[PDB]
C-alpha cells in the first residue's frame, strides 16, 4: 500500500505544516503537524479542557463506532519549546492520504499548555520519530509509520515541504519526479530516537565549503535550523547588523538585508538553502528587526535540521531494519 498527503504551511512564515488525517467512522479530519521528532500521534478532542479549547477540530471518540478506549492508558508530552500535552488513549482507525491502519493509538488531550490553544490551525500532532520515544504508560504504543510499515510497498515516507506554499507527505514510494539529480543516503543513529545523522558541514553564501561532522536530527515539526553556536556565527557574521539578542530569543538582522544561502552537507553532497529561506520577517508587527531561521543550538543539546533546512530539500526517511536518511535537492 502507499499513502500521499499534502501538506500546507499554517502561516505566512511557514511556522509549522498541518495534513489532514481522518480518524475514526465515519471519518473525522483534522489537521495534524507531521513530527518526524517525536512518537505521539495526539489530538484535541471532546476531552480536551475547554478552556484550552480556540477554535481547533476535535476528534470525538463516541461519535466513531471504530474508537475503542485503551483502558489505562495515558500519555504525557513536552516539546522543545516547553510547550505540552496530556490525555488518555483510544485507538481508532487512522487514515492518511488513502493509507489506513486500524487499531492506531490515538491519543486524546485532556490538557494542552497555551502555545497549543493559541495556535487554532494545529488540531494535533502526528509523531514520526521512532516508537521508542511514545509516551504512552503503561503499554507503549506504536506510531502511525511504524504501524504501516509492513504493509507499504517499501518500507519509506517522504518529506517535501514547500517555501511559503504546500508540499506532499508520501508512505511508501518515492516519487522520482519530485527532486533533481540523486537521492544522496546517510546512516542513521535511532539510539536516542531520532532520524538522527551527521552531515558532512557547511557554506555561506559563495563561500568555500567547511568539512565538520555537525550530528544532528531532521525534525518536520522544528521550524527553524539550531546548528553549533561556531556555525551559526560564521552565518551571521556576513549580514550587516545581525546580532544575537538575549531579549528578542536569538539572532536578529535588518530586515533590509538580502541574506546569504545556507549550505550542508549530506555525505559528499550539497543541499543550498536559499537565502530567503532564512528570513521570518519582523521580530514583532512593523518591525525593522527581522528573526533569523537559522539559530544557535547551544543550551538545546542537539542540533536540529528543522523546516529552513528540510524544506530546502526532497527528504527520504527509510525506516527499513537498518534506518537512513536521503536528501535530494529539487
Ligand atoms: C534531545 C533534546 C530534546 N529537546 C527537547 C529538543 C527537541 N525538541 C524536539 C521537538 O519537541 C520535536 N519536534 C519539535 C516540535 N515542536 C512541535 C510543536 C511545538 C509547539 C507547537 C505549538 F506552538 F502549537 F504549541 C506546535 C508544534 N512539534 O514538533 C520539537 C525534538 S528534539
Known amino acids: 500500500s502507499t499513502g500521499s498527503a499534502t501538506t500546507t504551511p499554517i502561516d505566512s512564515l511557514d511556522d509549522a505544516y498541518i495534513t489532514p488525517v481522518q480518524i475514526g467512522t465515519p471519518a473525522q479530519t483534522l489537521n495534524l503537524d507531521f513530527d518526524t521528532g517525536s512518537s505521539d500521534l495526539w ?28 483502558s489505562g492508558a495515558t500519555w504525557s508530552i513536552s516539546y522543545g519549546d516547553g510547550s505540552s500535552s496530556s490525555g488518555d488513549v483510544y485507538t481508532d482507525t487512522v487514515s492518511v492520504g488513502g493509507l489506513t491502519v486500524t487499531g492506531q493509538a490515538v491519543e486524546s488531550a485532556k490538557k494542552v499548555s497555551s502555545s497549543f490553544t493559541e495556535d487554532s490551525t494545529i488540531d494535533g500532532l502526528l509523531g ?33 515541504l514547500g517555501y511559503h506554499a504546500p508540499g506532499t507527505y508520501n508512505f511508501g514510494f518515492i516519487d522520482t519526479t519530485a527532486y533533481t539529480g540523486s537521492i544522496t543516503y546517510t546512516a542513521v543513529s535511532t539510539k536516542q530516537g531520532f532520524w538522527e545523522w551527521t552531515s558532512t558541514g557547511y557554506a555561506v553564501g559563495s563561500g568555500t565549503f567547511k568539512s565538520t561532522s555537525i550530528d544532528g536530527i531532521a525534525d518536520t ?62 521580530i514583532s508587527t512593523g518591525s525593522s528587526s527581522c528573526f533569523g531561521g537559522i539559530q544557535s543550538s547551544a543550551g538545546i543539546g542537539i542540533n536540529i535540521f528543522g523546516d529552513v533546512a528540510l524544506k530546502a530539500a526532497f527528504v527520504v526517511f527509510n525506516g527499513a531494519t537498518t534506518p537512513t536518511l536521503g536528501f535530494a535537492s529539487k
Not at 45 to 69: C, F, M, N, R
Not at 137 to 159: E, G, R
Open 128 to 160: 514520526l520519530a521512532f516508537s521508542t520515544l511514545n509516551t504512552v504508560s503503561p503499554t507503549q504504543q506504536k506510531t502511525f509509520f511504524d504501524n504501516a510499515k509492513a504493509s507499504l510497498d517499501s518500507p519509506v515516507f517522504t518529506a517535501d
Open 43 to 70: 489530538v484535541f478532542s471532546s476531552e480536551t479542557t475547554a478552556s484550552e479549547v480556540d477554535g481547533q477540530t476535535i476528534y470525538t471518540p463516541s461519535k466513531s463506532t471504530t474508537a475503542k478506549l485503551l
Open 221 to 282: 515539526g522544528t521550524t527553524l535550523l539550531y546548528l553549533p553556536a561556531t556555525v551559526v556565527s560564521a552565518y551571521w557574521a556576513q549580514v550587516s547588523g545581525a546580532k544575537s539578542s538575549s531579549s528578542v530569543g536569538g539572532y536578529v538582522f535588518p530586515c533590509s538585508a538580502t541574506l546569504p544561502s545556507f549550505t550542508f552537507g549530506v555525505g559528499s553532497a550539497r543541499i543550498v538553502i536559499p537565502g530567503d529561506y532564512i528570513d521570518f520577517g519582523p
